[PDB]
A paper describes a structure:
Many antibodies capable of neutralizing a large fraction of circulating HIV isolates, broadly neutralizing antibodies (bnAbs), have been isolated from HIV-infected individuals. VRC01-class bnAbs are attractive vaccine leads owing at least to their potency, breadth and protective capacity, and to the fact that their in vitro neutralization curves typically saturate at 100% viral neutralization, in contrast to some other bnAb classes (V2/Apex, PGT151, and 10E8) that fail to reach complete neutralization for some isolates, likely influenced by glycan heterogeneity. The H-CDR2 patch makes direct contacts with four gp120 elements (loop D, β15/α3, β20/21 and β23/V5) in all VRC01-class bnAbs. Thus, while the HIV Env trimer has evolved a glycan fence around the CD4 binding site that imposes steric and entropic penalties to antibody binding, VRC01-class bnAbs appear to have evolved solutions that avoid glycan clashes and partially offset the entropic penalties.
To further dissect the role of light chain patches in interacting with the N276 glycan, we determined the crystal structure at 3.25 Å resolution of Fab VRC01 bound to an engineered gp120 outer domain (eOD) that contains a Man9GlcNAc2 glycan at position 276 (eOD-N276Kif). The VRC01 interactions with the N276 glycan contribute an additional 550Å2 of buried surface area to the previously defined epitope, and an additional 229 Å2 of buried surface area compared to the 45-46m2+gp120 structure with a shorter Man4GlcNAc2 glycan at position 276, due to a significantly different glycan conformation, several new H-bonds, and increased stacking interactions with TyrL28. All three L-FW3 affinity-matured residues (ArgL66, TrpL67 and ProL69) and two of the L-CDR1 affinity-matured residues (TyrL28 and GlyL29) directly contact the N276 glycan. Together, the Man9GlcNAc2 N276 glycan interactions constitute a third of the antibody paratope surface area. The two-residue deletion in L-CDR1 eliminates a steric clash between the germline-VRC01 L-CDR1 and the GlcNAc2 base of the N276 glycan. Steric clashes between germline VRC01 L-FW3 and the N276 Man9GlcNAc2 D2 arm are alleviated by mutations in mature VRC01. Structural comparisons with other VRC01-class bnAbs co-crystallized with core gp120 suggest that all VRC01-class antibodies have evolved similar mutations to avoid and/or utilize the N276 glycan. Fully-solvated molecular dynamics simulations of eOD with a complex biantennary glycan at N276 suggest that mammalian glycoforms other than oligomannose species could also be accommodated by VRC01-class bnAbs. This structure and these analyses thus improve our understanding of VRC01-class interactions with the N276 glycan.
Residue numbers in the entry:
A (entry chain H): 1 to 52, 52A, 53 to 82, 82A, 82B, 82C, 83 to 100, 100A, ...
B (entry chain A): 2 to 171
C (entry chain L): 2 to 30, 33 to 91, 96 to 213
């Protein structure tokens, strides 16, 4: 029964180096090529490289060419992944894998439990809140250009529950999250009641209150 | 005439003809502008499965093996599989000469000609015209990283770092 | 060489078939990996149609030309999650088979929001398209500027199926900068949905 046990989850600062181990038992270690694959949230799975234990033959993925280095120890049946010059993009759960059959390498039957890494820059970007205004009417707030996740909006400090829809954030090419939060209210109400959304962003300790005037 | 940093120094009778070589292909893709190739990265089973080998046990470079007729012939189980080693056989051999002083000389111009042939055949397999890069090994044991062979029951380690450092266009 | 999976998010109730498609750009055996939430991903299908270990016969792979299908005949809780397709070292973007309570069809109430003047000063301009309370989740939003389609400049998001409503809401964030925005005077958001007879359009002038 093949087992791929790897290191525990790590927290790293940007620009630092990282080492992760993965030892395996249940099969003869030297026989099968070993791969590393990182999975980022809302992102394509990414193959990092493979490593052939008999002679330490190695093949690094071209995007990572400079910053990736993986080695092996034959005697304790283990492989090590090393990632230098960390960036916030590199936050992912890192898996060591081995194929089903010993040399068709790509049918990844066996995965580790995963080693989650979290590089997070102490630099944070406060939310920019922009109103959205018009039988029934809708008015909301655009929480644009903030970093990182998450923010939690509300309306009238919680007086408004019904009709409110807050949306999952969206990663713009800017690298900064922008979400929207709308509410549907009666058309008449636009004149009678004032509508304030309360954007709360703990990573920056910013807590913006914004009004949506008709 | 390129020379080889060699450890230890190889006696004259160890000087021989080069027949072929082993190329591992770097995993893609970026943009299919170019392909990176490195020596070795091949297990002994890949070498045996290649069937062109001679008597000499070696890494990266086939020695004292059988040549193939007319054109350089490249073979792999699957070329689109970068985990599979590429076997290269030459019609014209390349006489690697060891002085015994510790540096193995080689005809630079001739090795340029053979390399151009390989790159041409690689393009034939990997698409009409992709620029081809030859770089040194990514890493591993000295036997895989350095060109390592056996002569008279004694092992020798030569660095092909000088050798594999080219780039070809079309 | 890239792998394109469709749909991005397939959603439907337990007890009915789910079908996932993966478009390839080259030859080579293709695999299918299931990934349950929080758990490591699991190899479902390899070499096109052969199932891995512990995979029931409810999973089948189908191939025609460059296209591959993973069909899960009878949806159980354990089947829901996110599926990826693979060809050598490359993966597809992913698909998310998620649960969906069946209810009556509802047409979306659409609103369009011009960009905040303060944002306009900052240099950027974000036009928002709101689609509220519609069933089912599959609905298409088309951005046109001076009656001209747009691609890649816009982004989207859909709510979790709201418990009371059992209905989906969508937000389309159309993003520009001040220059291009002021140039074009008039903008329109086009919504085509199952509960809609005709593509409802919501537009405005600068
Ligand atoms: C590394 O390894 C990988 C594997 O891991 C290798 O990948 C394999 O590579 C093979 C060769 O390169 C490749 O075979 C090709 O596949 C072609 C496409 O096959 C699919 O599409 C067929 C229908 O296509 C039609 O429609 C699409 C789009 O709609 C168009 O693109 C096409 O042009 C057509 O218009 C479809 O029939 C086929 O399924 C059959 O094959 C499957 C095998 O996996 C079966 O499961 C399936 O049931 C079908 O089987 C039927 O047909 C076979 C005979 O092919 C028969 O045995 C069965 O009983 C059943 O009847 C796929 O869905 C395909 O077009 C190619 O076929 C032509 O060429 C061969 C010669 O190679 C001829 O013998 C054949 O008759 C046919 O002739 C055509 O071409 C002639 C000249 O080439 C021409 O004269 C003639 O008029 C015809 O046009 C061929 O089979 C594999 O698909 C591929 N495998 C995978 C998984 O991707 C890879 O190559 C390796 N890498 C390297 C570098 O070597
Ligand atoms: C290879 O062959 C040559 C001559 O054919 C011979 O001198 C040499 O000893 C052989 N072995 C090696 C390792 O060069
Ligand atoms: C290599 O082969 C050639 C002819 O094929 C022969 O003349 C030469 O002696 C051989 N050995 C060396 C070291 O070149």
């Amino acid at each position: 029964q093949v087992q791929l046990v790897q290191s525990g989850g790590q927290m790293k600062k940007p620009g630092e180096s990282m080492r992760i181990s993965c030892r395996a038992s249940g099969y003869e270690f030297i026989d099968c090529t070993l791969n590393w694959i990182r999975l980022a949230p809302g992102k394509r799975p990414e193959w990092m490289g493979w490593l052939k234990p008999r002679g330490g033959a190695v093949n690094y993925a071209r995007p990572l060419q400079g910053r990736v280095t993986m080695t092996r120890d034959v005697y304790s049946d283990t492989a090590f992944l090393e990632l230098r010059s960390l960036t916030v993009d590199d936050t992912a759960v890192y898996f060591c894998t081995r194929g089903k059959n010993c040399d068709y390498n790509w049918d990844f039957e066996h995965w580790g439990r995963g080693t989650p890494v979290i590089v997070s820059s102490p630099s944070t970007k406060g939310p920019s809140v922009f109103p959205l205004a018009p039988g029934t009417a809708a008015l909301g707030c655009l929480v644009k250009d903030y970093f990182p996740e998450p923010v939690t909006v509300s309306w009238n400090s919680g007086a408004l529950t019904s009709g409110v829809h807050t949306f999952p954030a969206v990663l713009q090419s800017s690298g900064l999250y922008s979400l929207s939060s709308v509410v549907t209210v009666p058309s008449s109400s636009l004149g009678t009641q004032t509508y304030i959304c309360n954007v709360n962003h703990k990573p920056s300790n910013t807590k913006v209150d914004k009004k949506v005037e008709p | 005439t390129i020379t080889l940093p060699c450890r230890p120094a190889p006696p004259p009778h160890c000087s021989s003809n080069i027949t072929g070589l082993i190329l591992t292909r770097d995993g893609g893709n970026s943009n299919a502008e170019s392909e990176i190739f490195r020596p070795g990265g091949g297990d002994m089973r890949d070498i045996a499965r290649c069937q062109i080998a001679g008597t000499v046990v070696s890494s990266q470079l086939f020695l004292n093996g059988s040549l193939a007729e007319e054109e350089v012939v490249i073979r792999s189980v699957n070329f689109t599989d970068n985990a599979k080693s590429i076997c290269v056989q030459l019609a014209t051999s390349v006489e690697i000469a060891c002085t015994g002083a510790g540096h193995c000389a080689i005809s630079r111009a001739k090795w340029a000609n053979t390399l151009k042939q390989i790159a041409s055949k690689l393009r034939e397999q990997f698409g009409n015209a992709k620029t081809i890069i030859f770089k040194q090994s990514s890493g591993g044991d000295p036997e895989i990283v350095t060109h390592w062979f056996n002569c008279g029951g004694e092992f020798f380690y030569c660095a092909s770092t000088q050798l594999f450092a080219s780039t070809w266009f079309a | 060489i890239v792998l394109t999976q469709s749909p991005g998010t397939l959603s439907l109730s337990p007890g009915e078939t789910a079908i996932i498609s993966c478009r390839t750009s080259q030859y080579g055996s293709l695999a299918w990996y299931q990934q349950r939430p929080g758990q490591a991903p699991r190899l479902v299908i390899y070499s096109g149609s052969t199932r891995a270990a512990g995979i029931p016969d409810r999973f089948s792979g189908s191939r025609w030309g460059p296209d591959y299908n993973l069909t899960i005949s009878n949806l159980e809780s354990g089947d829901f999650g996110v599926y990826y397709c693979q060809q050598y070292e490359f993966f597809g973007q992913g698909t998310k088979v998620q649960v969906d309570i069946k209810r009556t069809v509802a047409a979306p109430s659409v609103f369009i929001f011009p960009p905040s003047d303060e944002q306009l000063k900052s240099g950027t301009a974000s036009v928002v398209c709101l689609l509220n309370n519609f069933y089912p989740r599959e609905a298409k939003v088309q951005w046109k500027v001076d009656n001209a389609l747009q691609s890649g400049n816009s982004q989207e998001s859909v709510t979790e199926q709201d418990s009371k409503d059992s209905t989906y809401s969508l937000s389309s964030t159309l993003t520009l900068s001040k220059a291009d925005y002021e140039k074009h005077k008039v903008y329109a958001c086009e919504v085509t949905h199952q509960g809609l007879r005709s593509p409802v359009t919501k537009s405005f002038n600068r």
